[PDB]
Design a protein around this ligand. Structure first.
Ligand SMILES: [Mg+2]
Ligand SMILES: [Mg+2]
Ligand SMILES: [Mg+2]
Ligand SMILES: [Mg+2]
Ligand SMILES: [Mg+2]
Ligand SMILES: [Mg+2]
Ligand SMILES: [Mg+2]
Ligand SMILES: [Mg+2]
Ligand SMILES: [Mg+2]
Ligand SMILES: [Mg+2]
Ligand SMILES: [Mg+2]
Ligand SMILES: [Mg+2]
Ligand SMILES: [Mg+2]
Ligand SMILES: [Mg+2]
Ligand SMILES: [Mg+2]
Ligand SMILES: [Mg+2]
Ligand SMILES: [Mg+2]
Ligand SMILES: [Mg+2]
Lengths: 88, 109, 98, 95, 111, 243, 46, 236
RNA sequence: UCACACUGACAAUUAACAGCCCAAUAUCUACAAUCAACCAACAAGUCAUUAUUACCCUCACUGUCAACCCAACACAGGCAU
RNA sequence: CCUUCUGCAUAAUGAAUUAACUAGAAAUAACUUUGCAAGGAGAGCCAAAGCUAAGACCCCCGAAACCAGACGAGCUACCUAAGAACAGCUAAGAGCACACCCGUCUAUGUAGCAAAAUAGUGGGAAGAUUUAUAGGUAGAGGCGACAAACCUACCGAGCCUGGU
RNA sequence: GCUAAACCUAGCCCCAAACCCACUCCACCUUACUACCAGCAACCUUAGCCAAACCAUUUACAUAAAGUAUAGGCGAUAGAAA
């Protein structure tokens, strides 16, 4: 890593880039290494990368579930601290 | 009819059984008449040196001292290899046609 | 009349984006990225060709560009050639007697 | 191109928030249409020698069909603007 | 190595090198008494036949003649209090055969 | 457990988040403007008030637009301020009858225009209202330059306007070589616009297109740290010797 | 006849009728997989 | 759904093409024609309807010769290979079209009539009045688009200026240009209408499912209609 | 523990059988099989290649067990070559 | 015992006990008592003794059934491609008869072997025949040698989701 | 006395407050957890149950003005601003 940083200043040996799949979640797409370019590969052309608008509802639902889990954990920690204070 | 059963080569039919397979890592290819071609260039060659007169051993002695941990960084390597910078009072910027390119992982391990 | 159905033939390419008909700005497309996207106009890539040669992946030259090409409409015969007439055709092509 | 009127009348919703419509408000009523109307003859000045129907440098009430098919595309006339009008006035005064 | 991307050899590329091997190997006792000069080996999944041949010839210099590998299936008929299946780790097995009739015997321990 | 902002503010939140924040200021201002459209499918009441019958008393009224539809053909072809009206109608214009849905459509044509700023003929599916507007504007270029963003509603028209603005701002030889007088006269014919080149690029571009342009602009691959370290060492040597 | 035996197992037909490719070709399967992931099931599809 | 029609061939060929049965289904999968599907396998034979067609580096009239007369399972009219020059092709077999017979394929419209035989093909501008013809073309260089079935025959009526009023077998007149190509004689395989199917086995083998079992009520359209002959359909 | 196929470790099942498979350009296969020669017939039928360019390294991977599959059961039931 | 109904042990339904869960949320107005009064209430509302504030009053389970999109031809109906099967005997969409396809009838079974089984008498068994593999036809639909039959055990139109 | 009976702590609901997560190593749109080679993909008035004892037009998505105007098979109902 030090040699690579001093030779080109590039992070992470394996190259890559961020992309948006169908689910919409920002996934770090991994390069598979090919021989032919991308503007003519039949298989890679099928691997589209877009989430479309209707997935916004599912994204909002996932965000709400995560927020609910976080609030539950926060209330749990608060109740634990309150019980600990009550014990002493 | 099992969702928890991880799909593998011991499940599907002959076609998918022979197609998928375990981590085989294609080393060659087929030539029409079911005649596989073993590319000598794609076959790995374990570069094992001679272990003659080796000083160290796979186990250390507790009597040895203890030193602090300091992950090596780029700044330290640059400060170490600072001969021409001081002599000013050689570098490989572009390495696209190099043997073992750095940024594009072309060398194994 | 002509053979070959349109549906079976190669599908007609899509219509070129109208942004290219505005001589002349920088048509922003997804060429910078490396994946198909609905929005953003479609780019136009150049003709790519491999440098080194490959045995299994080799494209021969056209029918005219060759190291030797004769214009005389020659004809060759082999075992698979099934004549029509038979004896008379062979006698004519050989100039012999039966 | 097709004028349309609303049914049930909007119940008014001030000016800040948008007017919350309803499924009944979707109903419409055709009141009038742009087409099916007596057309008008736009004014166009000619730039070259045209048939007896017109004269060089003489604004006339030309029809829309011809003005859009032959005159304007071929540059034989120009819209009744103030700039070209002043240019034609100067050309006439130059006589 | 294992679990590492390999450099795709196009056509006029250099010979593939493998420095600092990752995967390992280990022999076991014959199951139903194998023939003479026939050593067994438990190889992981990411490993072929010529791979093991070169591995041995380079590390232990054992004159390996022929090799015949195969994959074994792990048990899975067992459930805990949660009623969840447990699939044991799978592994590949090989049957290396020495050359020159060296005649090797599996040594025993715990006398 | 609840959110911090409403549901109709996530758009602005994302716009102010990161990459959308680095965008220019004029683009964000034009996007946030959101002006009202021009009346087309409804008589716009001039006076704000109107004395309704059955009672001589003034009342406040407004003009609500008609939820118009914009199919892809409207964005691909220069269409006026009209489109596909999606609504419902009774039988004989009486609520006492049945209710049935209805969808109107405009009248399309195929004319051949010729713009002087671009010097090229096109074949666009123009309508009658668009032709009337072009005739009233005393030129297709004037009609394209007068209609703002949300008033023209069409990606092709926005691209044409952006190209015309870029051409008027560049003021370089390109129109008619070996004819500087003609180019000068053409530029003089249109002088009430000419947006600067900095603001002329972000004209009509969509959100995704603008983000892509911004990404391509400030790309800049990671510079090797070797040059930075060499510069730091040079600065250190300077501070040690000179100063 | 015996109506308690209708299942004819076949990995080919199973994966062709309920496969990741078939579930991602159309937006229907996309929404199905999204709802499944939202529910929290272990297996998303065969 | 995935449905690629077998009709996919560029260059004309003599070998039988592997025919893929349809079954009254469209590209989607739904049935559009009741009574089709389930029969005997068949191999399509590429036929060349355009009789007159000069081969490469040719233009003037050419001669041909019949070699064999075979049966065609696709249509009801038998066919017969006819080679000529330096190529071969299939064409409709006319009545009394024995093998080893020479056939002419002219085109130059002569001044006077031409006593055409039974196999030769000449344009309508050189055919006597009142002569049976078949494989009539709708326009010059179009191809046989009408008479072609077995036992069919088109009698010539008259000519006007530069056209010819043809009388189809259904008593429906039609006028076409006089410079178009046509064929004399009638199609072979005579007496095909009298073919006794005998049993349902042959009908099922031919590839035709039976009719539905619904007892439909004969509407008003099930009455005897005596309409007059329609007007002459021209194509000038 | 009807007595145990129940609970934890042991290791199997090693390819030669089958799968994993074809470089391009113009280009062409009229006489079915039925002991196919006598006898022929209708439902008209499953199997082929020509010239040029470039190609020379060769044994990699998967399946291999059982009293076994689908029927809530250890099921007089259903299953092709 | 409870409920119904003019009428009950009635032979009208409910019920084996035990532990847990389980079925009246409030309204213009009205009644009682507090505080001030032609005024009170912490803007707004009511005033020919009025208002403010408090107290007190509006049950549960139960269908058939519709909408929009998913899931469904691995069994059933049809179609498509390439394959497989049909002893023998008498002698042609011929006849008997193996395998094989379906089950007109008896008997057993009826919480059984089976949420559709066991034997023969049964029709065919070189042809409108059966079947191994894959793909296509999905409900306002598909298919249908019409049985208005089938479309995953219940299809006069299968289930789910959200309106319910 | 066999069978039984109780423990209460992990965690849950409300808002009160901030706006959240997201690549160590290989693998994942072809048959998902498959190192490898020549071709179209986007924007759509929601319906319906129910109440008028049926049901078609109809039926909902800080305070005061005000449940007023107004609309409504002018009946069941709906219902704003200055
Ligand atoms: Mg059962
Ligand atoms: Mg076995
Ligand atoms: Mg009671
Ligand atoms: Mg009661
Ligand atoms: Mg009573
Ligand atoms: Mg009783
Ligand atoms: Mg009083
Ligand atoms: Mg089936
Ligand atoms: Mg049937
Ligand atoms: Mg009976
Ligand atoms: Mg009984
Ligand atoms: Mg019968
Ligand atoms: Mg029989
Ligand atoms: Mg028999
Ligand atoms: Mg239903
Ligand atoms: Mg109700
Ligand atoms: Mg009602
Ligand atoms: Mg207000």
């Amino acid at each position: 890593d030090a040699l690579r940083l001093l030779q080109t200043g590039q992070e992470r040996a394996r190259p890559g880039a961020w992309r948006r799949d169908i689910f919409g979640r920002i996934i770090w797409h991994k390069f598979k290494q090919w021989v032919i370019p991308w503007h003519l590969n039949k298989r890679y052309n099928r691997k589209r990368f877009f989430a479309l608008p209707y997935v916004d509802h599912f994204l909002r639902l996932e965000r709400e579930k995560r927020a609910r889990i976080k609030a539950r954990k926060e209330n749990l920690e608060r109740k634990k601290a309150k019980i600990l204070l009550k014990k002493f | 009819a099992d969702r928890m059963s991880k799909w593998t080569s011991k499940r599907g039919p002959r076609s998918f059984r022979g197609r998928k397979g375990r981590g085989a890592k294609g080393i060659g290819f087929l030539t029409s008449g079911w005649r596989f071609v073993q590319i000598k260039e794609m076959v790995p060659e374990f570069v094992v040196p001679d272990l003659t007169g080796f000083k160290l051993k796979p186990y250390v002695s507790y009597l040895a001292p203890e030193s602090e941990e300091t992950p090596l960084t780029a700044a330290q390597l640059f400060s170490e290899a600072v001969a021409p910078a001081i002599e000013k009072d050689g570098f490989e910027p572009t390495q696209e046609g190099k043997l073992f390119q750095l940024y594009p992982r072309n060398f194994l391990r | 009349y002509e053979w070959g159905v349109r549906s079976t033939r190669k599908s007609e390419p899509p219509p070129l984006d109208r942004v290219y008909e505005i001589p002349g700005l920088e048509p922003i497309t997804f060429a910078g990225k490396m994946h198909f996207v609905p929005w953003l106009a479609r780019p136009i890539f150049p003709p790519w060709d491999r440098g080194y040669k490959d045995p299994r992946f080799y494209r021969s030259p056209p029918l005219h560009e060759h190291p030797l090409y004769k214009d005389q409409a020659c004809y060759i015969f082999h075992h698979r050639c099934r004549l029509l007439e038979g004896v008379k055709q062979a006698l004519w092509l050989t100039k012999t007697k039966l | 191109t097709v004028i349309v009127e609303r049914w049930w009348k909007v119940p008014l919703a001030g000016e800040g928030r948008k007017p919350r419509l309803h499924r009944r408000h979707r109903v419409y009523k055709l009141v009038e249409d742009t087409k099916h109307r007596p057309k008008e003859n736009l004014e166009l000045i000619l730039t070259q020698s045209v048939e007896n129907v017109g004269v060089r440098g003489d604004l006339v009430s030309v029809k829309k069909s011809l003005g859009r098919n032959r005159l304007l595309p071929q540059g034989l006339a120009v819209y009744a603007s103030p700039e070209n009008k002043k240019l034609f006035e100067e050309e006439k005064l130059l006589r | 190595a294992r679990n590492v991307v390999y450099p795709l050899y196009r056509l006029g590329g250099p010979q593939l090198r493998v420095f600092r091997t990752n995967f390992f190997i280990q022999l076991v006792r014959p199951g139903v008494a194998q023939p003479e000069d026939t050593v067994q080996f438990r190889i992981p999944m990411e490993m072929t036949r010529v791979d093991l041949r070169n591995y041995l010839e380079g590390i232990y210099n054992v004159p390996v003649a022929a090799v015949r590998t195969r994959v074994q299936h792990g048990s899975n008929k067992r459930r805990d209090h949660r009623n969840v299946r447990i699939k044991k780790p799978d592994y590949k097995v090989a049957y290396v055969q020495l050359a020159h009739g060296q005649t090797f015997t599996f040594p025993d321990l715990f006398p | 457990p609840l959110h911090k902002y409403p549901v109709w503010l996530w758009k602005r939140l994302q716009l102010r988040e990161g990459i959308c924040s680095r965008l220019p200021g004029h683009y964000l201002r034009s996007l946030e403007e959101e002006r009202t459209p021009t009346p087309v499918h409804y008589r716009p009441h001039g006076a704000k008030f109107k004395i309704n019958p059955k009672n001589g008393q003034r009342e406040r009224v407004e003009d609500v637009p008609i939820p118009i539809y914009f199919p892809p053909e409207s964005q691909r072809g220069l269409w006026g301020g009209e489109g596909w009206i999606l609504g419902q109608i009774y039988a004989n214009n009486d609520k006492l009858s049945k209710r049935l849905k209805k969808v109107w459509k405009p009248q399309l044509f195929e004319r051949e225009f010729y713009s002087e700023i671009l010097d090229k003929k096109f074949t666009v599916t123009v309508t009658m209202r668009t032709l009337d507007l072009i005739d009233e504007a005393y030129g297709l270029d004037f009609y394209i330059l007068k209609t703002p963003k949300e008033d023209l509603c069409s990606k092709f028209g926005m691209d044409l306007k952006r190209g015309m603005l870029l051409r008027l701002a560049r003021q370089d030889p390109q129109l008619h070589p070996e004819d500087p007088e003609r180019r000068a006269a053409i530029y003089d014919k249109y002088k009430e616009f000419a947006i600067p080149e900095e603001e002329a690029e972000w004209v009509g571009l969509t959100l995704e297109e603008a983000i892509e342009k911004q990404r391509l602009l400030e790309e800049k691959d990671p510079v090797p740290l070797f040059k930075i370290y060499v510069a730091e060492l040079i600065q250190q040597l300077q501070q040690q010797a000179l100063s | 006849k015996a109506r308690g035996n209708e299942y004819q197992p076949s990995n080919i037909k199973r994966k062709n009728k309920h496969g990741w490719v078939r579930r991602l070709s159309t937006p229907a399967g996309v929404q199905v997989i999204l709802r499944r992931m939202l529910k929290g099931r272990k297996s998303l599809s065969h | 759904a995935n449905f690629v029609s077998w009709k996919s061939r560029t260059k004309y060929t003599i070998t039988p093409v592997k025919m893929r049965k349809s079954g009254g289904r469209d590209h989607t999968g739904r049935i559009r024609v009741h009574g089709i599907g389930g029969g005997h396998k068949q191999r399509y034979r590429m036929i060349d309807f355009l009789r007159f067609r000069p081969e490469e580096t040719k233009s003037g009239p050419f001669e041909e010769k019949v070699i064999q007369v075979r049966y065609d399972p696709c249509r009801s009219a038998d066919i017969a290979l006819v080679a000529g020059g330096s190529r071969k092709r299939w064409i409709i077999a006319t009545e009394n079209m024995q093998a080893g017979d020479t056939i002419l394929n002219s085109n130059h419209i002569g001044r006077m009539a031409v006593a055409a035989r039974e196999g030769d093909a000449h344009p309508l501008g050189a055919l006597p009045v009142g002569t049976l013809i078949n494989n009539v073309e709708s326009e010059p260089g179009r191809g046989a688009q009408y008479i072609r079935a077995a036992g069919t025959c088109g009698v010539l009526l008259r000519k006007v200026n530069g056209t010819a009023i043809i009388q189809l077998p259904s008593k429906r007149q039609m006028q076409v240009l006089e410079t178009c190509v046509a064929t004399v004689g009638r199609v072979s395989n005579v007496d095909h209408n009298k073919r006794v199917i005998g049993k349902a086995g042959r009908n099922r083998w031919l590839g035709k499912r039976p009719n539905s079992g619904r007892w439909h009520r004969k509407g008003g359209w099930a009455g005897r209609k005596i309409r007059p002959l329609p007007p002459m359909k021209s194509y000038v």
